[PDB]
Amino acid sequence: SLENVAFNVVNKGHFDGQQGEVPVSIINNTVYTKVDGVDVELFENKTTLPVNVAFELWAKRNIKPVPEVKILNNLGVDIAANTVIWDYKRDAPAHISTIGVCSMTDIAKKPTETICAPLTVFFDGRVDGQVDLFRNARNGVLITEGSVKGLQPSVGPKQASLNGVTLIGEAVKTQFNYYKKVDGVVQQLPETYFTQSRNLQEFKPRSQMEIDFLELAMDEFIERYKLEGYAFEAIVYGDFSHSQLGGLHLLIGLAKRFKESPFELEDFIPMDSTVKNYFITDAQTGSSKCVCSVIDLLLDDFVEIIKSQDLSVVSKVVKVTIDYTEISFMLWCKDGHVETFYPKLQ
Amino acid sequence: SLENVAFNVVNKGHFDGQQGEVPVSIINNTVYTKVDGVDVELFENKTTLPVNVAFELWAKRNIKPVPEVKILNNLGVDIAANTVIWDYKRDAPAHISTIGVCSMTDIAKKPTETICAPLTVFFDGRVDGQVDLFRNARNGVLITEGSVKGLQPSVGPKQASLNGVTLIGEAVKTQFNYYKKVDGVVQQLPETYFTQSRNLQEFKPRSQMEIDFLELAMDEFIERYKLEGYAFEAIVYGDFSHSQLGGLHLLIGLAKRFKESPFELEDFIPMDSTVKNYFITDAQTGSSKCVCSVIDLLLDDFVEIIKSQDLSVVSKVVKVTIDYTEISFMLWCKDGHVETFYPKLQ
Amino acid sequence: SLENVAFNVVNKGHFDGQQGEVPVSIINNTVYTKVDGVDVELFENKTTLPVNVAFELWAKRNIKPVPEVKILNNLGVDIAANTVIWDYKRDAPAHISTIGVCSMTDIAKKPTETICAPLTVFFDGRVDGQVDLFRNARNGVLITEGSVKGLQPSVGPKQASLNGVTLIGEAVKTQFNYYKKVDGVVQQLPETYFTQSRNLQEFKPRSQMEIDFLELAMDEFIERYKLEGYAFEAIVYGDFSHSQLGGLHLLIGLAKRFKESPFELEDFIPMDSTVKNYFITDAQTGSSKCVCSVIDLLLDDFVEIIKSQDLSVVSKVVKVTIDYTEISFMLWCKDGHVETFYPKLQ
Amino acid sequence: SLENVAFNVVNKGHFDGQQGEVPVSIINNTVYTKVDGVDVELFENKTTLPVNVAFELWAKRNIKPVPEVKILNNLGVDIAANTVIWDYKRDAPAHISTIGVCSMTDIAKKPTETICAPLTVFFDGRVDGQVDLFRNARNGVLITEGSVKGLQPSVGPKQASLNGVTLIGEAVKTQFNYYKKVDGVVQQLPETYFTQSRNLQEFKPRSQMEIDFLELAMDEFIERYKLEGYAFEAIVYGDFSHSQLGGLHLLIGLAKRFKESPFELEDFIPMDSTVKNYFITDAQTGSSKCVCSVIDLLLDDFVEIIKSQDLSVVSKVVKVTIDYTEISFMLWCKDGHVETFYPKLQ
Amino acid sequence: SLENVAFNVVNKGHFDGQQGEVPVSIINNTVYTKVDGVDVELFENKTTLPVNVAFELWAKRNIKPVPEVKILNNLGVDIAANTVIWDYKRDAPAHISTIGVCSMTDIAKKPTETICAPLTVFFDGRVDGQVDLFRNARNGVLITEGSVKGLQPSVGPKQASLNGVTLIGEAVKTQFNYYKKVDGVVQQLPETYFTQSRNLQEFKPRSQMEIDFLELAMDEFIERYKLEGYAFEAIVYGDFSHSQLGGLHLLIGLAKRFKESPFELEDFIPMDSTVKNYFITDAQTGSSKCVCSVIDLLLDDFVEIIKSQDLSVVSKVVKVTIDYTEISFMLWCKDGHVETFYPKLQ
RNA sequence: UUUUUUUUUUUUUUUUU
RNA sequence: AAAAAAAAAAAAAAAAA
């Protein structure tokens, strides 16, 4: 019920299954409630769904730590079992359909129905009975905080999303063990690097090499870590000396530049992905690049990736498995040295 | 509940207080429900109220024969007790607020509360307990199908509105006795004429004089009923010889002209009122008047009204009480005969 | 392309695959095009889909005689192969998804993909290669104007829908052979009666018995056809003596009453179905019923159905296969004669 | 007039009653004006009112220091006399109706009419003649910058709202004397505490003990002010060790935690109230509480309140009058020391 | 095409003339594209134009450094030749019509057509062939990065707008030479000062005098630069002692105040102009002025302007050519010293 | 195959510095 | 010597057709 959902939102912050109703008015893709005689905005519809449907899906969103939407997209998750994963990047549900959540978006009441067999249903092992549901599911992805009997786990990212906040949990557990089944067979998930899902304005280093990068100059950091000949001066630090921006494909370099000279990052595809494309304009020098692909790889991981390459190649498309998906990089070596190594995904 | 109201609408045609819910989607001021997987329109909001509020009020509208909205407006009715009077002319509720109907529009749960004391509340005597409520009400209007002990009745119009259809009931009773209280005192409603609330394209005579008017010509009808000197050729029949349309202030004359030559009626204030103003354009001769006051009086009643006037006055404003309200007519006469007689101020 | 689709609409009335573009402006859920410098309305979106998606689907609607939407609904058709069936009752596409029509609504490019196997795909044998496509389909419905090798046909209704006009074709063939496959097995479609899909204001009899019903009085027609004891006075002709309308469950009776006393038909679920529920208000007597189940069976077929029943049962659920679906009727009889006969559950 | 209101907005920043007009276009709940041939957004309607009505009310808003909307709500104010109080928290007018401001929302021209008698009309003593209007008003609230002859004053909060900015005025007077009349009797307003209406990101201490709280650690501040046994470690400082966040019911503690590690405050009821409920998510540890009641009391005032309670009770509901309204707290104690103290019912 | 424009946006960040289409849905004045099965917002319309037209104009905007919109407005530019100048202040195209850009907004395909002759067409000398187009244009404005044969250049502002960012270019050239033709005659543009187009929260001094103003106190700066008698205590620094704010007509003084005490700036006309008018409310002292004219002149330039005035006049209107337009300053003096100096008509 | 594309360098052209 | 506008080239791919 719309009014029951609004009652739950106003009295508990989200849908908690409580009984009750409040006066609700819907106008201009917005849900209002009457508190002491005046209408108060409860929800503004930023989705393509009907305002009431999107409102009830938002109220019933998962408020526990959940995998980042990019991780679920890379695993081919099409739907979530008895829960709503909210995509805070898009301000919309991460999946078009639901299972036992919303009568308007439900394709089934349980993930065991025939309609859910072709779909990769996301199962949460923290919910009672969902591990057994995944065991019987033809296609699905299961996340657990611990071990599963008879199943080899895949250790995922250290961080997860909690109410739109990507964090490495201390009071709560955000590291999950990932399992996948395709056509009823448990797949072995490849060894992967994981993006750190950090922000430009609140960037915090997570390794000693990152601290050195943030505090040392270009020359000292490159000399200290023996990173000569891999074009770190352009790939990471960026070249703000021409009309077209050069490099800057690591968010750590973007944050380092933003610390001294804040710039603009136009996100023309506002979603959650392993590789993000930005229309970046440098407000200090005027350097701009219409498409700058930025990947939030740990600097140690990127160093290992770029040092694992073969430098004696004119040009090569390099496949790196990041966030459980194959990210293709455009290696551009020349005369035995790297000239450019940027993420080309998205 | 929105879903329960929609369930009642799809299973009973209107809100009947049944339990159950159906999936509902709201978009573009329209209520949809999903029948067999496809969205089906249930309600298009044509009011200034929020779409869900207007949908709930429309579903809970009175489906019994009710007084025409113009009658209630002339009686000063400000609100209805535990019911919704739907104004089908405006496709909106007849009153801004409700009593114990919709949480968003309610000012009280019962008409006995102090908020409803100053307002003139409409009480329906066919609903159990409403006569006693009207007895204790400070201001109110009561309609009953029969007599009320200690209250002298006021016989109202023969016709009443049934689901937007104005009809004289045969299988159902559409004639009510009207009782009004102002400041706790049972008022005496004046003796009034009543408009027939007929349509131009569905006009049906309700008297022998009207039949003769429709079938007999101008001169024959005027001579037969001794209507010389009252300017019936212009006031009722209408003048189409000049670019500015003359007379045509009775719906019977408009019906007679429409029978021979259809014209255009631009209702620039589409509401229910005793006197209606139209932008008439004659498609045959090109005669047009921007404001033409048309009143749907019985032809016998109008003849009696015009014959009860004093003809020895050049200009005189005639006050006629029609539909429980005083309608002002401007009477122009010369040489002891009527020259012009239409509702004044147009 | 939106502009190419609008170009096809303005130059051919619909999408014909022609090349060219016209200026298009979208505002207020409406598509406009610029003709001689002024904006002209091309399409108003009455669906729940985005205006551009609905416009593109409407342009690519099937303009050939197609089965009525109720027939495809009863056959369980979930999607159409490389065509759009437009539901003119709802002014919306008959199916939420498409196959190789609209990138926004397409789930596949061809009906053979794995996503279309669980669905019942509608195939039109008048399009080359669709019969073999149906032969390869796990679930599907095929209509043909002629015979199909190795398949036993099921003769459908004499009428079909042509641009929203339900007609029995003379210049074109509107009678189709129906074939159904469920889980790869050709099904034997049941022997069915077919509704005539006639209108109240444009009702035309299709049999001599219907002619007699329309012209003869109640008693003369009942005595002529030996229809005594089947309560034809109530079920078909209808009863308007009480405030609650009785009977009026056959569209021919509604048409006969409308011929003499026009009344209001409130379609509170405006969609295409074998049984239609109306909020009928008799404008002459005031009799009204909130839910009136009206089925447009041929009068001869309904007479055969009512005479094929066993009269010596108090209450019995009567199952009739109409329009390829089972319609359940309420049969109340007393003293070996019918008292009421209406579609159950209304 | 809409054009005159827009003229006043573009030439003076608000409605000043000047004469003149500017071109105005209304589209998508937005008011535009044409400046040198290009449309400029003047107002976006975030209210449930019509766009032009909300625009006129926003132009005619009070630009003088006015009491905070929570103070007026706690005093029972339903309407303001000849002025508009703008609720900047909701971006909407604080009251549904007006007195002599907007013809669309006016219920009267002057507060002396009968309709305003049952309502608690807000009067401003800084406007000439409103003190006498309050004297003759049945129900009303009067604010003055000085003394009123014969009326005992209630000193209000030091801060007031000035164009949506809450401040303690230096060049302007923001402290008002409050008077209330209920049913014609001048009420004695209770002695109350007042919330400081401070922000999280712009928190500024207003007392020495607040400064000590912000600079000193938990143990030092607790020991210095003899606050052992009042559970200040959880109530104010907050506990972030478990998944469910504990305490953090004073805005000063939230500000202290924000100064070190920023977190997210989801205000699911964005209005002005003495007690605010937030969906709190700690971005550093992962602690989260769906509903966290935060009250912005002076730390000295809160310490006095907590020291005025009786500690020898297991569970007790504490009634504290704050911002002219009774705020209820749960007081849980064990072994003669406080275990929990939060506003009741959250 | 809408789909091609969206494909260009998602693949290159802007319209680059690529071939290809993506699925697009338009709803609620917003453009969405489907990426991996979920709708992603691409553009939200804040213009008065249709959503698709505004989306096409925004995608085809100029992404190279361009003159600020105020400069083009002061030059009388009505339209741009084969390009879209985006007004990021209004989030709308700077000009109503286009030339060979969008079919819905085009008045011509080339600037040589007769319709463009009366209009001042903006030409970009960096685009090939536009200098010759300006040479044959009746009315136009040409900007070049270098010399033009036979034409005397007018050196413009050092800064330009790049993707909505105003900057003095280092990697790009932001200083242009301005040429204007009126009725086919090359005009000599007046010698003018230029506003620095700085922001309050990101103010950076561009001269030694500005540095001294920001660091030194008011008295020290006034004494050092011999600025006694020019009322710099009010005009630049501002007065906050009274309820009405005094002076504060230079953005540098507003920035100095914002550094020590952040306040509110209500931009009630959000557009680009040489003189900006703000509703400034001081959060610390409570001083507010409904309309405050603020001009972003270099402090050295303003000092030269105020020292070039004739002090022996009581009231005098000063005409200053700033940003190629004549800004009217109101000068009040007493006893041979400046009392007040603000742009007139506020 | 075709056409277009890809946040590398390289020439060639061209203006303007 | 640049710079930028306009081409082409080396290379690995991505489509679609």
Author numbering:
A (entry chain A), B (entry chain F), C (entry chain D), D (entry chain C), E (entry chain B): 1 to 346
Paper lines:
To understand the mechanism of poly(U) targeting by SARS-CoV-2 Nsp15, we reconstituted a ribonucleoprotein complex of Nsp15 and a 35-bp dsRNA substrate comprising the final 15-bp of 3ʹ-end of the SARS-CoV-2 genome and 20-bp poly(A/U) extension, which represents a coronavirus genome replication intermediate. To capture the RNA substrate bound to Nsp15 and trap the target uracil base at the nuclease active site, catalytically inactive mutant H234A was used for the reconstitution. The RNA-bound form was reconstructed as a homohexamer with clear A-form-like RNA duplex density and refined to 2.7 Å resolution. dsRNA density is diagonally attached to the outer periphery of the hexameric barrel and occupies a shallow groove between two subunits of the top trimer (defined as subunits A and B). The nuclease active site centers are located near the subunit interface between the neighboring subunits within the top or bottom trimers and the bound dsRNA fully shields the active site of the subunit A. One end of the dsRNA stretches along a groove between the CTD of subunit A and the middle domain (MD) of subunit B, extending upwards beyond the top trimer. Although we added an excess quantity of the substrate RNA (10-fold of Nsp15 in molarity), we only observed Nsp15 hexamer with a single piece of dsRNA as a substrate-bound form. Within the central region of the dsRNA, we observed unpaired bases: one base is flipped outside from the RNA duplex while its complementary counterpart remains orienting inwards within the duplex. U/A pair was modeled at this location and the flipped uracil is designated as U0. The local resolution of the bound RNA ranges between 2.4 Å and 4.0 Å with the highest resolution around the flipped U0 base. A total of 17 A/U base pairs were confidently built for the consensus Nsp15-RNA structure including the 10-bp preceding the flipped U0 and 6-bp following the U0.
Remarkable stealth activities exhibited by coronaviruses are facilitated by a series of non-structural proteins (Nsps), such as Nsp15, which is a uridine-specific endoribonuclease that mediates evasion of host detection of viral double-stranded RNA (dsRNA). Nsp15 limits the abundance and length of poly(U) within the negative strand RNA 5ʹ-extension by trimming down the initially synthesized poly(U) lead sequence to the optimal length that can suppress dsRNA formation but still serves as a template for poly(A) tail of the positive strand genome of the coronaviruses. Nsp15 C-terminal domain (CTD) belongs to a family of endoribonuclease with two conserved catalytic histidine residues (H234 and H249), which serve as general acid and general base, respectively, to attack the 3ʹ-phosphate of the target uridine. Cryogenic electron microscopy (cryoEM) revealed Nsp15 hexamer structures at 2.3–3.3 Å resolution at various functional states, including RNA-free and two dsRNA-bound states.
